[PDB]
Amino acid sequence: MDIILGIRVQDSVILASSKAVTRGISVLKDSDDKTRQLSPHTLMSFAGEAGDTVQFAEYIQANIQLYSIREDYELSPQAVSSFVRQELAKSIRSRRPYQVNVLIGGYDKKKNKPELYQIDYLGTKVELPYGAHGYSGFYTFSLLDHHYRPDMTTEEGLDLLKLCVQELEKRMPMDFKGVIVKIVDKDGIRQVDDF
Amino acid sequence: MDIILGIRVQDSVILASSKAVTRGISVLKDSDDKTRQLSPHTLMSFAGEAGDTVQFAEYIQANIQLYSIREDYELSPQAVSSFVRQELAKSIRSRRPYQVNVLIGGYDKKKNKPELYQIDYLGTKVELPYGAHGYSGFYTFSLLDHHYRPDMTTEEGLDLLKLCVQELEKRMPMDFKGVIVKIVDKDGIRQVDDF
Amino acid sequence: TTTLAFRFQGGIIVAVDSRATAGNWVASQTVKKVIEINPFLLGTMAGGAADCQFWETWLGSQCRLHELREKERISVAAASKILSNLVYQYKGAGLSMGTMICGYTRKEGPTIYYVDSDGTRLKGDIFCVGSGQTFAYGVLDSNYKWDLSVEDALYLGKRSILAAAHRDAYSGGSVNLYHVTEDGWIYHGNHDVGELFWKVKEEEGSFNNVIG
Amino acid sequence: TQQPIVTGTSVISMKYDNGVIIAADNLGSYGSLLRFNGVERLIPVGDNTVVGISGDISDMQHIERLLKDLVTENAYDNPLADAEEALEPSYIFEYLATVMYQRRSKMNPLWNAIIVAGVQSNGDQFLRYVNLLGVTYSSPTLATGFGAHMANPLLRKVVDRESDIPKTTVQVAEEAIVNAMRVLYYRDARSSRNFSLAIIDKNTGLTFKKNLQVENMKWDFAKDIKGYGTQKI
Amino acid sequence: TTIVGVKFNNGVVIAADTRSTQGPIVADKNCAKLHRISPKIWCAGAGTAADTEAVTQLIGSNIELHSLYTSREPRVVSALQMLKQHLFKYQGHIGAYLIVAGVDPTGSHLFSIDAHGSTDVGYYLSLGSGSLAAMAVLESHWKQDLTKEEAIKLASDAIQAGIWNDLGSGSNVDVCVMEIGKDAEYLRNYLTPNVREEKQKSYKFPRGTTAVLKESIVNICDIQEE
Amino acid sequence: TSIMAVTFKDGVILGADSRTTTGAYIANRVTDKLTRVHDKIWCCRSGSAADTQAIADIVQYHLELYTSQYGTPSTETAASVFKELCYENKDNLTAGIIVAGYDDKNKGEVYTIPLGGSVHKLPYAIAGSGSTFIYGYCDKNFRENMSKEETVDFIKHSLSQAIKWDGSSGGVIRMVVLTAAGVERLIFYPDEYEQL
Amino acid sequence: TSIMAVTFKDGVILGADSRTTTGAYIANRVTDKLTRVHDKIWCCRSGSAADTQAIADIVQYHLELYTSQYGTPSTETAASVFKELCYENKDNLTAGIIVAGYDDKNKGEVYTIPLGGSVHKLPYAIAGSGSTFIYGYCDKNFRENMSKEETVDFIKHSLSQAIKWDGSSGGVIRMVVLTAAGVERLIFYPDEYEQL
Amino acid sequence: QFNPYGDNGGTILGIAGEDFAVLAGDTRNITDYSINSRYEPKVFDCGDNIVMSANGFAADGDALVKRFKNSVKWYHFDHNDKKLSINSAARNIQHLLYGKRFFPYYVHTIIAGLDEDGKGAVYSFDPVGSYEREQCRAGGAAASLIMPFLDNQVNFKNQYEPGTNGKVKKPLKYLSVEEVIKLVRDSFTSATERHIQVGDGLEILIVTKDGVRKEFYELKRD
Amino acid sequence: SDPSSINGGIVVAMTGKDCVAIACDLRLGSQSLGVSNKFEKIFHYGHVFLGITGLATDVTTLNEMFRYKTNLYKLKEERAIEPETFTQLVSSSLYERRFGPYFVGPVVAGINSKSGKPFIAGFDLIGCIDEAKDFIVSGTASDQLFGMCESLYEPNLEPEDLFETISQALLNAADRDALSGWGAVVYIIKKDEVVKRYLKMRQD
Amino acid sequence: GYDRALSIFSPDGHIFQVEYALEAVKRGTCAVGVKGKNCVVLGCERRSTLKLQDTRITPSKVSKIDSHVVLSFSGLNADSRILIEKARVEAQSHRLTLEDPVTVEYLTRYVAGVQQRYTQSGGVR
Ligand SMILES: [Mg+2]
């Protein structure tokens, strides 16, 4: 799929993902949720080749849910991101690789810190204050480089995110039909239903 | 460029053309007028390869303006469309052909009839009640086939045109940044400044 | 090819054309593009004819095995996912499918899943697939409401295929209608496009561009 | 997938009233080089079958070894190996046709065109074709390669349909075959003057003729031909 | 296409089949492949059908003007030289494969021409997709000092071999005989061995079977007086 | 093709097979590859039949016009005209020509013009696809100042072997003898040369 | 390469040049192309040097193991083992091998195995790039039941011509004589064979 | 490079009557511009009152027919000599074809017979196994020449009743076996005239409750 | 990509007793997209009728070209051009573009005004004349047309019977071609009257 | 091509062909131009030797070069059409490249340049 954004503020991680799904000529859907909850305090958004994206995301989800039951314990965002990276790093030298890029937003309950990880289909992992995949960063990073502060509130993070989406809606040729926004904090995962 | 539409109603011809201009990655302009007035009662919209479109349109404009001065007489829409077709039919077997598709909307003052001509870059001319170029017809023709009547008013034509643009804005992947609409009737050419 | 399916108050309408072509040559005007998976589930045929036929009757076999083992009707979600997981295993090998898996159960209500040979599986309210899909979308989008009657919904599906059959060179022949209820699907006949076009033109006042 | 290296050209054949005739020249070409001049491309199996092979010679030698092994295998625990349970032309063909189609299906063909000629137990004439693709067909006359284009037209003037077979004697049939071999020598650049001919008759059995030559050739008219148009001297 | 040429005692004969094809489809069942360059110089053509006619008429036109200029009857070697030089200049792109035959004050002649411009001399020749079938017959039955009757028989037999055995050739046999000191006799449809059998059924429709929307008289006449 | 020209005591003799092929089909089995560009200047043709016929016709025209103005041309002059056409049009031609002639001053001469358009004056020359198989035989058996009968035998035996091994060569062996006495054509049939 | 094997009255003789090339560079000018797979069964190698060395080493292993179980193998048997390797691995090999041997029962025998992997028993055989230039010479000059001295001269003269015309062939002419008397190696240098 | 496929030409035609079914095909076998055989049977009796033809690449065609005949044999062994119904045969052939989905049998298959109510039946297959029951179906080289004619003369398409002018269609009256054979012969005679790969002979297999009967007719040999 | 099947369409012509008929469909498209149902492919210059299938720009261009040429012909000759002469003009005009041809399939139909003899002819894109006694076909459904005409046609049909034969030949051929249809026209041509009939057909 | 020098100097430094062209202007019907404060008027003479003339269709003496510029003349009528056509083409060419209509001075400078060119070009008068 197309645009996926992420921003880590003071006490939460915010992920924004486009709603459009395009089958070449036509837009088949304009309400698609490009994300999966891996654990109560860990969310993963994704974008890449059709089919592979959901197949990969659900496979990861199943594995983390299996771990949670076996140990009666939630893995840290860092631990989840490493597991995901290894799967993609394994995938890139397979017969047919997963063509999937992901953002992992999680709140570490031990350290009481939000964390945002950016991983591409090759298995290239980086921890960032804000990140993106595809052409999304080309339009948004200049705004984020200017306005971002590490002590931002969740409301300030959403406002900076709106400015990013407005710039995308102005200068991008494709109509991505807006974004679904989700927040990850100490209380878990919730969706902002008006954006 | 992208979407150009045309519809011939009772007493006028209406042409609608997109405002966007895209240089690959970015949308450079969102207010571009893809049309030229050939004579007081004849308008031509255009879409095709960058540069060639405007070069061709202005070349045609100059020739029709030259004819008007020499004879002190306005050529009929039919006569103008035939001249344009011959230029494109000549062009297609040149060293480097004009990659330009056009719609010609005119009001014939002799017959007191509106006329709409559709011509592609090969020099393929057809007179139609409504027409389009590119993928525009794929989305709009099913609506026009249903609602169109030969005795429609200009206001009814504009309403049917709004329904076509709404369907384009829903199902097309590209953001064409709305359309500029122009009406051609017995009193000449005017632009609808709110659409 | 033109195939559509949409959700509404009274369940699901499925409508398809009947034409099959090999290049410009019209091979058949009497093709069946609705696969009757079982008395409760329907699938549409677009892309590869064999791929859709073979794997959707296979799907019926898997659904039958499920309800024998679990003593319960299979969900549309589970049925669609068996098919999508199967074609995903073959990804790269050259399968060609674009289908809508349609059903109506107690727990889900009326449900439609678009399933693709590149692995895509999407839940939705309105889907339209084929070379004439854009024409059918136009009629659907401008006339669709949730509170359509069964009679009006059936006509909307019939009219939308007609719109595609007229303009799309590779769509036509005849229209096959289906109505999916909770107690199973109901067939609503075969309608020749040639006869249907003139009937609709006169009664509706549409297609004034065409002389009749 | 391979390419043929050392190759053999046309095999020609036809039915007549009491049996079948088959023929093929003794050349093994290496491209345009006429490299090997003593190659036998007709291979008899028992006293009722002759298999004629064109195309790749290395693959021909392999097929020759398969047929040799087939005779050995048929004799095992078979008291009627030289009587009722002897190898028929139809058995030999079907076996080869199976192999040819299987090999093309593994994308590793035996690069040949084969004609099996023989007489069955009940006296019926057998004549059928198979090639590298596993394609098979039967006809009153059969020919491979250039023979298909030049021999068949001549042989079809003798036996044009099924009803012409009882009306065709062995003398008339052999005459037609020998003439066709001469025509192929005139016109095929990968042919030789030396050839082998085999007759399988329901009364007189298998007659195998080696070291035959093309004779009665017309070349004298060449002396009057000068230049390519205007030249007189 | 099958075309042949055969020399005999006092002249030369050419022949051809009558099938022209568009891939696997038969476009015309009774095509005329024997072309006239001049009254007593005829040629048969294979390959691109437009090219064989175009090149035959151009050279035929220039041959006529040459004949008027020189006050002499045209020669086959002149037709040959003009044809090959034209074809060589176009490097094979004009896909004309011709058998040129005729009689002139010098005698009787028979040549073949390839699309690239190569020519050759012979007593018997064949060209086209059925040339191998035809040449098989010619190599089997040709001899020196053939009579007129024997040459016509041999030529038509060679075309028949092409008709029956080559899918590119079919229908009828056309012949043209050019004898010294005589008018050239063009024998159109000399043999007709492929007449279609009567059909099982008549497919004449009842009048009014077809649905009609509009009728109107078309004005083919000029603008009228009064 | 198999072609050769050989100088000897009384002049020069040209030799050739008669086979013309399109692929494996023999399009003409009685071809005349020995071609006359002047009374006692002939050539042997190999390569594209169209190209070598077009070239030979142009050379014949050039030497006819030369003769009308300056009298009989030399064999060297004929070779030069061939070379000019082959060299300047090397990109568009596939021709391998051997030029052989008899003067009274220079006697028998042979010039070979390969693909590139170079000229090489030689005591004898061989060319065509079949020539590859007789480089050994010809080099061992050629002598200078042979008699007419010896030269005929040398060419007959040589082209016989070329024909035997080269599928592209065959038919009759044509020869043209160039001496002070005049121009003599010879022909040898398969039954004769195959048993050698 | 230029290689050949010739049967004669007392047995068989193998012959070869000594040039190994990588393009136009002579990678080895003193190569030994005559290779021993058994006491009196040798081979001549042409084509890929890697392929023919690998094949010959495998054949030598097969015949050594054959000898330990069943006694001395026939030349026909050695040729069959070569064929099996060349035929079954035709897609991956570029090898042209001539097998020559001496039995007491069968005397001198020669088998040639071209690219495809076919087998051909012959009175004599020639192979390699240089062989093309001596097909004519060898066919005219070979006789059956020659003496040792005549056969040495036939091979010397033949490979001399092959070397003269083929750039890929050159160096010394190696020979191996196989008779009842035993195994004799011969070598002939450029100054000797060039003046022939 | 090795090409595992070829084209043997040929044309086949299946028509389903009220209580009968015919499967016809020409007997000519070809490659490029040459004739391999003037009589090479292409339509086969497979047992259980079923006739079959697999037109296109003859090697694949012969392989498929051979495997189906085998499937009929083993159906009898495994299911107590039960008669294989035409619908069951059709589904079985789909699985044979789709089994080689990624290296297909390069043929267009048609079978004919009677259904379990005794009514005429024809089934049509694409190379990879998609199939339909049909009333009328031509296959192979001259299919495009034959089908439009059948639409007009069997289904009476574009034919209306005189006097009404387009308002009333010509009624779809049932055709006899004699009437169908007339249309088959005229179809192939016309195809022979205009398609180079069609000719030599026409073999028709007729299927009724009484069994399978054969008819042969000459075609033009040029 | 293939210029001769971008726009689609068909033409057929037939002879009868003292009459000729020429007919065509009305579709113009951009591959799968149907663009026009009023694109007539039959034109006439005096009493000579010309049908043209293929690339639509060339169809329009050639009509304008032959109108041009037949108008100059008439002014100089002082008489209308005949079918036999016009056939040669079409052939000449097409061949002059031998190595850059118009992608068309023309069909000529008419009656000679002096002899009264019915005449039809067809051409390939490059000028080769096919002058048949019975019928001529052209376009994207030419295979289908060959099949219909070969079975439906019989010689010496009366004008009103010929109308039914050619109409059924066109209609059923067009319905087996994706790029043909959307209406049809039939011309019945006698020595001094011509009738033009539009046919009712399926619009898919 | 015809290259003859028709316009040449004479011993007294005159180009007679240019001077004889002025004598043709002297023969032509009178034309007058007057500019006011906010307008310009062009007056022209029509010789009444020609009656039975159709004044609807007869070429008018004043010609529009563009919508904002006009041209009148005295002299040879056929010659003036060539200058008028060239001027009209140049007016449209200026609009096409400069995206602004010609000034009156520019249009005059062009027409005057064409006239000059025909006084030192070979083969023309
Ligand atoms: Mg060397």
Ligand SMILES: [Mg+2]
């Ligand atoms: Mg034929």
Ligand SMILES: [Mg+2]
């Ligand atoms: Mg349609």
